[PDB]
Amino acid sequence: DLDTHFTQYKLARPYIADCPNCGHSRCDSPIAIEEVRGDAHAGVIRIQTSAMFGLKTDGVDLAYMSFMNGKTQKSIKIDNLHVRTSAPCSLVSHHGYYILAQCPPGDTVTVGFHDGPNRHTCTVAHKVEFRPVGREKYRHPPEHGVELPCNRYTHKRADQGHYVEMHQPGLVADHSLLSIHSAKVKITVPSGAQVKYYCKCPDVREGITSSDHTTTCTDVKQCRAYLIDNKKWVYNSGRLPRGEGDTFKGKLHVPFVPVKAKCIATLAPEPLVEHKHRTLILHLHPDHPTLLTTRSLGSDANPTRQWIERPTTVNFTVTGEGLEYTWGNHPPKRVWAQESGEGNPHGWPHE
Amino acid sequence: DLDTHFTQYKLARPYIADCPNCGHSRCDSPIAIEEVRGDAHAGVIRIQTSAMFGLKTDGVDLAYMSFMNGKTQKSIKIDNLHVRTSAPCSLVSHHGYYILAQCPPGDTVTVGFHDGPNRHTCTVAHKVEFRPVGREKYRHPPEHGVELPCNRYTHKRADQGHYVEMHQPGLVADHSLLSIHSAKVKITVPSGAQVKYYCKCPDVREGITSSDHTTTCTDVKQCRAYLIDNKKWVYNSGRLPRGEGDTFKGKLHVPFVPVKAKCIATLAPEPLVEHKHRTLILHLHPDHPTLLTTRSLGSDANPTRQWIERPTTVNFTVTGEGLEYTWGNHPPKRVWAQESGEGNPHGWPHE
Amino acid sequence: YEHTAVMPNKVGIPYKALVERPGYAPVHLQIQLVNTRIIPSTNLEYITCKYKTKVPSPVVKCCGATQCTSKPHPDYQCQVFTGVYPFMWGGAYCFCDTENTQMSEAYVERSEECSIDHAKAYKVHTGTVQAMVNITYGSVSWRSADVYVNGETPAKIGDAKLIIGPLSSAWSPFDNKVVVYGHEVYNYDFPEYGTGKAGSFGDLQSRTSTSNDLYANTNLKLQRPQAGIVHTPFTQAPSGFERWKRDKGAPLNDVAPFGCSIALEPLRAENCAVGSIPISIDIPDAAFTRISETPTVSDLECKITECTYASDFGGIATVAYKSSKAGNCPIHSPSGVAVIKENDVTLAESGSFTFHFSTANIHPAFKLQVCTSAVTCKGDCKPPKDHIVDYPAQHTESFT
Amino acid sequence: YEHTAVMPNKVGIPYKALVERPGYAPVHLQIQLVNTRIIPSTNLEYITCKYKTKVPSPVVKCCGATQCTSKPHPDYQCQVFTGVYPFMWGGAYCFCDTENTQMSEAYVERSEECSIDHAKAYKVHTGTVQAMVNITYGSVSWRSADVYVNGETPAKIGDAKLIIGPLSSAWSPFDNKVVVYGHEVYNYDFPEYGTGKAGSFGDLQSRTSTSNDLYANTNLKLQRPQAGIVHTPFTQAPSGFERWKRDKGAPLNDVAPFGCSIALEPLRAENCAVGSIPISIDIPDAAFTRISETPTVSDLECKITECTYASDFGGIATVAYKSSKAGNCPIHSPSGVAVIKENDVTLAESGSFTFHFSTANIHPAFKLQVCTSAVTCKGDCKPPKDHIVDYPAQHTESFT
């Protein structure tokens, strides 16, 4: 699709905000990454840029990229963005501030394209794993092993399953906003917005203050270029401060929700589950860390816990009423006993 | 009132039903009494006729009288009506299918307008009790005491705050509806309805209905003269069945809710509060039975129960955190312990 | 340290206590309790109230057996009857010639009085219970503090943390099961939930006052239609919140333990006057008056300047005060047998300063706890008397 | 006659019980206590789930009298930082020399995973108690029906009239307050919802996945954004979700006594392998097989001609019975101490006729009470291997 929820698209407009670490003396780049979410366990990561790529703010094409340079957009191709995490990602779809991308897992996320007088890249921390939700935990994107139940992302961008605060935005600097009132620096709107203000010099800065500007300060770089977008409510980033005198309502959804089904997944290479006489001999040979653990079945209790991330023949003494064997977030298996070494006389010879 | 409540009126018709103490073999009473409500704490009693008196079905006046004769209304003056309960009532107001009328409580309700050679009445049983709230418990006040906060009905017709399940002006026979399909009995709609039906002859006998007609069995008395009305709502009566074809389960209010006002209530004078040393001497002399009870305070509960309906001096041992004394269902009195009668040491509970 | 008060719980009366503090100067209390609440972690099992036989409309299948359709109100009395021959205008509304069946159905349904002036059951547990005691210190300030069991909820209400024992309301005067009728609260059983039958108050169990579902048996009895002709006989007997108002339990707004009254409540005990409230507070220096006022109150003697024989406030007595350092000195009798209206009484070295009080006899030899020094204000007076007047301002009372 | 049977409440075991009787013929049952049911009343106190610092946008007051105010979705962690003269594309928006502060605010807010597949706390009330009980018969073939144990239906459901419980799994093996996160159950106590405890379970406490009120501190500590430019550092400890599958506490679907594994549950521990449901049935005498329409078994001998044994189902042993009567014959090793493949097998007099069963043995010397009269039904047979397989089909274990 291109159009999935004009909830986000129409009612949001890009903005440019500071990147938390960029190492160009800490560049400002419109790819300022907040909310990395490798919270789908299926190879896929949702990333948030501070700019609203997707549809420009209109009806046409996920294949554009509209960030702010100035107070103005810069409506160019989607593919001029480069999300990456470890190895280069492959886009799945963009919607709003949010992109879904097939990426390697990563402790960080590292996005970047040339913009400004620099190379304008952006990086941020967020712990990602494509862990099974259970007694296993995994790294790399699926390419092996059995499927078993964990999170996975929606390819659907209409989701009202959660919503992120976007109600009354505020500033980011865009001193392209800030014109001059013929000696003193003058607040202006990006494309509409109730834009609040102050300078180092005295000015009113509580209430709506789009009709107030500072009449005592000349320097542009000591004043509050604002975007309270109250008709195109933008993502509320940490690198986008809020107003304090205004209130608008415009809480706006997130397109991509990690949902649980049969995620494309992993299963740590096949364990040998064999029952001998009241004993599960278990040759084990995993890849990703598997918590093997048990539930000795019957009147019995006897659990065992040991993370197995190393090949080990272990044993679990199966009782008459059974033992259970829980090779990670692979579903619990079960074993009864009375033996399984074969041959307890308890009959009458005649054969 | 006469303004908005066309919820009930327009989307209803009075429904002709039946009553045991009537006719030469039971008259069809369109004033068939269900749901007597003297159950409140009041003095005014709510009756439900099957008839929708009030507005005719029109806009104005709660002092007309629309019962059903035929499939048609019979919208006339309310001056032929006699509400009574177990004493002659004076009507207060009708609203919906429900009439409020000022009369004493009563085990039965007995309604009737003269019409025919017979006096065409209807009566029904329902256990009714009013009471003044609190200590003094009666079936309704004697004629004495203070008014104090219990349930009572309003003068005015609109008096919402409850809702009963309404189905429709349900299934009742109206053989004025029932034409003949050339020799077989043919049901017709009262006002627009999916009219429920069956004969000994085939059709649907569950009352799953989308305009059932059985025109296969000759007799009018061997078929089910039933009416699931499909855009109308009236009080659920036992003498007005419902089906399940296109029945509503839509709760639609009851007017004449007993609401918190100042109910006529009880209290009998002469408490005659007197205190000599840690003791309330109390000469008592009530007009009518007073439930007295007290609490000599502390962790102490000290109950008292005594109906007082004739002269008795009682006593209640006041303590170091007082006693209260509750002469009837009027609120608690209060008393400090200590000697009246002059001259002692003081300054401890020891002197 | 702590806020002494060993002086009982009442209500109405402006009763007092004196905080023994030695690090700072003591502080007077007016312990005005008139709000007391319980409020545990609880669960509303069902609103109860007497029936209303709001005769439902049955899905009469008519003859050849009638099947009673399940209506949106759980539990229903429904009984097929044959030998009828219906009339409701004209003729039969059932499909047999005169071998017609009339299936009468009646369930109990919420009364309009259930909405307002009703009863309300509760299973009363403990999870959030509060012992509420306002003290308007008067010398210092107000605090209306509470106790809390759950520890994701503050108990630092008031100035700080205030501990009552015997508690002022952290118990319930009513039982675990409680039925309610207006003013009179009856600490009386009711049958669990979803199972209730007649012969108890809680035989009707509507989950809300005006509901859609309920549990409907209040001794509602269908009987055979009269004259071998259709209709619904509903015979209805007494129920919860009709009886048990003269079959009544203990009517707690006049008989509650802990000197309280009760009504329709999310579980609260209004207007308590428990045996005593020994109040103890863990409070900073702000709740006290400072030590600079007087480190210890050194010498004093008290004698009347004409007193009362009554716990009305009118008794006076000059006190020739003296102190280690001059300043303010909150006062009150350390038994509360004289209840003192003076928040603070000034002390200068070897001066004399009258205070105000209420006593209860002509020779008021009541100790006055002059912020670390007691003194008897003895002397003969004139006796005024008036002892019908509300709960003790002489509390801990059991004297003349 | 009235066949009591208690067995471990173990999900996957058909214990194939025997009504011992001599009035009528003994008749097989299967009292299979299938699936551990527990299910009491509960209360959702708060969802937990790994955070997402979904910044509400920092309320910034840069100079003079600071304010971080209040906007919808209360509870905001907010910390001023100086040494910044910010940039975000253009110049500084905090810039005075009376402060020079840029006030960053970040709260913890529910992740998208909070909505779906999430840790979920409960303070679980005592409530109801449930069981699930199969009863088969030596006539009737299976019914595995849910049966209550509280005040609602601890009577008849399916074949016979059956009185159920109390279970030994009437409460889960886990704590009163329980967190559940997917399959994995984590037992963690807290009193009730409010403002939780950071860096432990209930460090996020949102009443539900999308909410206004919450407790927003997963150990969220804002720090200075160095280099004179502003971003918002989030220093955060793992939540009760991240802990609970890879920084896990106690995974109760692998460490809850009995043999339990769990799904998302209010407080139920599915699949437990004890939790014993004591079943007692009042069986009408009619439902039996008559003792004269069964062999009143006599001349009991068990032998084989050829045999192969199976401890799951398929264990055989021919029987040389030359019984006084002949007929149908329900069989079982008395009272769920065997698994019988059959419900009923006919056995006559004269010859040899195999029946099927399964037992906790490798060759068939399990007693079998063949519609009167037990006998250990030996036969050479052949060892099976069939014990790698799940919850028993070899009863509660009692043979080789």
GROMACS .gro file of N, CA and C in nm, chain C residues 147-187:
model
  123
  849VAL      N    1  -0.371   0.584   5.750
  849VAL     CA    2  -0.283   0.471   5.761
  849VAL      C    3  -0.316   0.397   5.634
  850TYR      N    4  -0.221   0.324   5.573
  850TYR     CA    5  -0.248   0.247   5.454
  850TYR      C    6  -0.167   0.122   5.466
  851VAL      N    7  -0.225   0.009   5.420
  851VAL     CA    8  -0.165  -0.121   5.428
  851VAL      C    9  -0.086  -0.142   5.303
  852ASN      N   10  -0.148  -0.119   5.184
  852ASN     CA   11  -0.079  -0.125   5.057
  852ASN      C   12   0.024  -0.016   5.049
  853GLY      N   13   0.142  -0.050   4.993
  853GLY     CA   14   0.264   0.024   5.009
  853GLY      C   15   0.305   0.079   4.876
  854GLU      N   16   0.214   0.068   4.777
  854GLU     CA   17   0.221   0.142   4.654
  854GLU      C   18   0.127   0.260   4.664
  855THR      N   19   0.069   0.282   4.785
  855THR     CA   20  -0.018   0.393   4.816
  855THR      C   21   0.044   0.455   4.940
  856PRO      N   22   0.086   0.582   4.942
  856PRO     CA   23   0.122   0.659   5.061
  856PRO      C   24   0.037   0.642   5.185
  857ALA      N   25   0.102   0.641   5.304
  857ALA     CA   26   0.037   0.650   5.433
  857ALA      C   27   0.088   0.774   5.504
  858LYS      N   28   0.152   0.866   5.428
  858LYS     CA   29   0.214   0.986   5.478
  858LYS      C   30   0.119   1.103   5.471
  859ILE      N   31  -0.013   1.074   5.465
  859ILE     CA   32  -0.122   1.168   5.471
  859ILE      C   33  -0.117   1.241   5.604
  860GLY      N   34  -0.158   1.370   5.609
  860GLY     CA   35  -0.134   1.458   5.721
  860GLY      C   36   0.002   1.520   5.709
  861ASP      N   37   0.060   1.568   5.823
  861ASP     CA   38   0.196   1.619   5.829
  861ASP      C   39   0.295   1.513   5.790
  862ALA      N   40   0.274   1.389   5.840
  862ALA     CA   41   0.367   1.283   5.819
  862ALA      C   42   0.293   1.154   5.844
  863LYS      N   43   0.349   1.061   5.925
  863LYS     CA   44   0.289   0.932   5.951
  863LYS      C   45   0.231   0.929   6.088
  864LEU      N   46   0.103   0.888   6.100
  864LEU     CA   47   0.026   0.898   6.220
  864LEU      C   48  -0.032   0.762   6.232
  865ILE      N   49  -0.015   0.709   6.354
  865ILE     CA   50  -0.042   0.575   6.393
  865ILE      C   51  -0.141   0.585   6.506
  866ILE      N   52  -0.247   0.502   6.500
  866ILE     CA   53  -0.358   0.505   6.591
  866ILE      C   54  -0.360   0.364   6.643
  867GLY      N   55  -0.395   0.342   6.773
  867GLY     CA   56  -0.412   0.208   6.822
  867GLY      C   57  -0.461   0.212   6.964
  868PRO      N   58  -0.586   0.178   7.003
  868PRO     CA   59  -0.696   0.131   6.921
  868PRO      C   60  -0.726   0.224   6.808
  869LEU      N   61  -0.725   0.168   6.685
  869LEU     CA   62  -0.747   0.231   6.557
  869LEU      C   63  -0.877   0.305   6.558
  870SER      N   64  -0.886   0.410   6.475
  870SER     CA   65  -1.002   0.495   6.475
  870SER      C   66  -1.097   0.455   6.368
  871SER      N   67  -1.058   0.359   6.280
  871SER     CA   68  -1.138   0.324   6.165
  871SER      C   69  -1.069   0.227   6.074
  872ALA      N   70  -0.959   0.160   6.117
  872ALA     CA   71  -0.887   0.075   6.024
  872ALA      C   72  -0.942  -0.066   6.036
  873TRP      N   73  -1.033  -0.087   6.133
  873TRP     CA   74  -1.113  -0.207   6.148
  873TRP      C   75  -1.239  -0.180   6.070
  874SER      N   76  -1.328  -0.280   6.059
  874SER     CA   77  -1.463  -0.258   6.012
  874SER      C   78  -1.555  -0.285   6.128
  875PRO      N   79  -1.653  -0.200   6.160
  875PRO     CA   80  -1.746  -0.227   6.269
  875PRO      C   81  -1.842  -0.335   6.228
  876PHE      N   82  -1.878  -0.336   6.098
  876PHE     CA   83  -1.949  -0.443   6.033
  876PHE      C   84  -1.858  -0.558   6.003
  877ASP      N   85  -1.919  -0.679   5.998
  877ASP     CA   86  -1.862  -0.805   5.955
  877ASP      C   87  -1.809  -0.802   5.813
  878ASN      N   88  -1.749  -0.916   5.770
  878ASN     CA   89  -1.703  -0.944   5.636
  878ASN      C   90  -1.819  -0.934   5.541
  879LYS      N   91  -1.935  -0.990   5.580
  879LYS     CA   92  -2.053  -0.981   5.499
  879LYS      C   93  -2.133  -0.872   5.563
  880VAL      N   94  -2.182  -0.776   5.481
  880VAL     CA   95  -2.263  -0.670   5.538
  880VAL      C   96  -2.375  -0.646   5.442
  881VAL      N   97  -2.498  -0.624   5.497
  881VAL     CA   98  -2.615  -0.576   5.426
  881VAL      C   99  -2.648  -0.439   5.478
  882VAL      N  100  -2.710  -0.354   5.393
  882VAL     CA  101  -2.726  -0.213   5.421
  882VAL      C  102  -2.867  -0.174   5.389
  883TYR      N  103  -2.927  -0.085   5.471
  883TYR     CA  104  -3.060  -0.035   5.454
  883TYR      C  105  -3.046   0.103   5.504
  884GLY      N  106  -3.022   0.200   5.412
  884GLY     CA  107  -3.027   0.340   5.442
  884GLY      C  108  -2.926   0.378   5.548
  885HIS      N  109  -2.976   0.438   5.658
  885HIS     CA  110  -2.903   0.457   5.781
  885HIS      C  111  -2.855   0.330   5.847
  886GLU      N  112  -2.944   0.230   5.864
  886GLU     CA  113  -2.914   0.110   5.939
  886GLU      C  114  -2.840   0.009   5.857
  887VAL      N  115  -2.717  -0.020   5.903
  887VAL     CA  116  -2.627  -0.113   5.840
  887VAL      C  117  -2.630  -0.232   5.928
  888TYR      N  118  -2.646  -0.351   5.867
  888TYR     CA  119  -2.664  -0.472   5.941
  888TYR      C  120  -2.552  -0.558   5.897
  889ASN      N  121  -2.470  -0.597   5.995
  889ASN     CA  122  -2.357  -0.682   5.975
  889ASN      C  123  -2.408  -0.823   5.981
   0.00000   0.00000   0.00000
